[PDB]
């Protein structure tokens, strides 16, 4: 069990990782507090030649078009050309997408 006693350091590393996810997970709540407006999304895949191409086309409700890659958290029911999405003030990022109807 002398070879398996190095697992203790690994577990202290990982519970330390669970100690340190509280702050960077804590800023999720204060950055993602209020999606201020609703903006139309049109999904359009890009190519960069990692350097992989990944993009989407945005249109604000006040009809102003900007540029951004596919951003946010891990997406399954996203990537749709849909509306009612999360957005911060001038960052114009995607945080919380919801179905309108």
């Amino acid at each position: 069990k002398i070879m398996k006693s190095e697992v203790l350091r690994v577990t202290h590393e990982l519970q330390a990782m669970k100690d340190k996810i509280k702050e960077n997970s804590e800023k999720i709540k204060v950055n993602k507090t209020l999606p201020y407006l609703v903006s139309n999304v049109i999904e359009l895949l890009d190519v960069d030649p990692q350097r992989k191409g990944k993009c989407a086309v945005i249109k604000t409700s006040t009809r102003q078009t900007y540029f951004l890659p596919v951003i946010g958290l891990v997406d399954a029911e996203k990537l749709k050309p849909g509306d009612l999405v999360g957005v911060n003030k001038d960052s114009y990022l995607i945080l919380e997408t919801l179905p309108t109807e």
């Binding site: 204060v30 950055n31 507090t33 003030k89 001038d90 960052s91």
Partner: protein
């Protein structure tokens, strides 16, 4: 009841910290703190200036 004639001493330390902070002057409100010592009433000297992490409140 008294007021004097004050004048603010600015180093290049605080200046380029406000210029890195001005490159960090993206559209969002940003935060920082000026430090130094007050030697008298009517002169003020800055030395130490750092930045602060952003918040959605601003």
């Amino acid at each position: 009841a008294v007021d004097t004639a004050e004048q603010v001493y600015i180093s290049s330390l605080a200046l380029l910290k406000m210029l890195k902070h001005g490159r960090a002057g993206v559209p969002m409100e940003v935060m920082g703190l000026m430090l130094g010592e007050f030697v008298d009433d009517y002169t003020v000297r800055v030395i130490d200036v750092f930045a602060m992490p952003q918040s959605g409140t601003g």
